[PDB]
Design a protein around this ligand. Sequence first.
Ligand code: HEC
Ligand code: HEC
Lengths: 108, 108
Amino acid sequence: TEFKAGSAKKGATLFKTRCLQCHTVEKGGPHKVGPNLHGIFGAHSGQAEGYSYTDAIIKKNVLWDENNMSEYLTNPKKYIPGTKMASGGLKKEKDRNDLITYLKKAAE
Amino acid sequence: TEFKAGSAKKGATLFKTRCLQCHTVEKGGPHKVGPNLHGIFGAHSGQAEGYSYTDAIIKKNVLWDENNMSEYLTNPKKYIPGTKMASGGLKKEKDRNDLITYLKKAAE
Ligand code: HEC
Ligand code: HEC
């Protein structure tokens, strides 16, 4: 791809410091500011049940792959204009790689 | 995405007439001219065990999503120069959509 595996250990702590405020990843984890992310890889954007997403994220209808997820994370609003995710992005590829490595694993 | 679901029924018969010559899709199906495709979505190219792939397909290291799969199928050799898949492609989007719909389903 254009995604290279990194450190899941490193990725777990980036999740905690940059995503945990708004999201859960475990199966059976609740929706918070953002939706629970269990089973996100391979899914299309805006389909978790019982979460109120923006029109923007549903219509973009992104198919979530480690690769896709990387561009999103770099700059969420530049990737999906209209998204309400108020994350300013992970600008370093090395951070994105580690985070994705972790997510790939915990969201399964 | 840029993949719209189609007819799985239609997709099953396109598979039979355009892919079955070289591939199986069922779990536990054998490798033939081409590799068994069970569990291909989400996987990277050239990783089925016990299949001898080209250098080209392993190094391209494509991450298989309905979207990716679509470009491949349009023109395999233009998408992965060096691939030994001797398919000249599915030029109509409507055929690709139906086929992918089917594959999404049977490869699971
Ligand atoms: C609150 C301040 C957030 C932080 C920090 C992060 N995310 Fe987020 N996320 C948030 C919202 C409000 C939403 C919904 C967007 C909308 O327009 O409706 C999202 C959405 C996602 C998604 C898409 C989910 C889907 O399609 O089901 C993903 C993949 C995602 N968020 C991941 C993610 C990661 C990995 C984060 C840390 C780097 C992160 N988000 C931060 C709110 C917030
Ligand atoms: C024989 C004449 C083939 C036909 C007809 C189709 N495919 Fe094929 N496929 C074939 C080979 C020899 C290979 C290996 C390529 C290499 O360079 O090593 C492939 C490979 C695939 C792949 C990639 C598999 C992977 O990464 O594990 C896919 C996704 C694939 N083939 C799909 C596919 C479909 C859907 C077809 C019908 C439209 C089809 N192939 C035709 C040989 C042949």
